[PDB]
Amino acid sequence: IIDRIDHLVLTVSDISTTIRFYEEVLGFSAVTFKQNRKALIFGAQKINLHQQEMEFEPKASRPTPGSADLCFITSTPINDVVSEILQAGISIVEGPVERTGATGEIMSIYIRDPDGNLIEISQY
Amino acid sequence: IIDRIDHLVLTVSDISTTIRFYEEVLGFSAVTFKQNRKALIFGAQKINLHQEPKASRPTPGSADLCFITSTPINDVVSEILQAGISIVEGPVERTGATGEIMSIYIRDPDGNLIEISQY
């Protein structure tokens, strides 16, 4: 019986650049575990980071920057989030638009991180 | 304020092969919605399957995911072996999002790395 996703690994070109984006835009918090590895903490989950040329094993069969397509749920009014994104100088790929969430309908806004990963920020 | 991951999209070579793996091994349940869209559900989250908009570089086998199980991890190891699935690594202690976990690693049909763990 699987309960939830605990974490996932993003392979990126530059960890510093990735960290700045997730902290400043999404509000995540960067930490260092296993002495020298980086992760981004949010809620009760996390995203571990692997930089190209120094990806820890085992890893995906085809580690690829910009191959992620993730949806994050926000408790912030989605229109306020839209405004926050524009004020941060981030381009809106699409949205706000209605989508199907895991447990119901959500309003989603899409942006991209430094590596091209698609980030869907949504409110139920 | 971001609360959690709701879902993510996996780009795969064959939806049917992918669904069978996640249903038979991980116990996920496949569903259809809207334009004959397919997804795998578990807990209060889901994984959408693509065989726009999307990732800048949709790539099969590029996922590295960790799922939490409430099933005794050693029983999970046995289930995996009985299913004829190769164990990449584990059981081994690893760092979870909120503490130590015991993890077992396997791969799905596309080569995605799947970490199944218990706190």
UniProtKB/Swiss-Prot annotation, chain B:
The keyword ATP-binding does not apply. It comes from Salmonella typhimurium (strain LT2 / SGSC1412 / ATCC 700720). The lineage of its organism: Bacteria, Pseudomonadati, Pseudomonadota, Gammaproteobacteria, Enterobacterales. The keyword Mitochondrion does not apply. Pfam families: Glyoxalase (PF00903). Induction: Up-regulated following infection of host macrophages. Residues 4-119 form the VOC domain. Is critically involved in promoting the replication of S.typhimurium cells inside host macrophages, suggesting a role in the establishment of bacterial colonization within macrophages. May be involved in the biosynthesis and modification of the peptidoglycan layer of the cell wall. This is Virulence protein STM3117. SUPFAM superfamilies: Glyoxalase/Bleomycin resistance protein/Dihydroxybiphenyl dioxygenase. Transmembrane segments: none annotated. Keywords: Virulence.
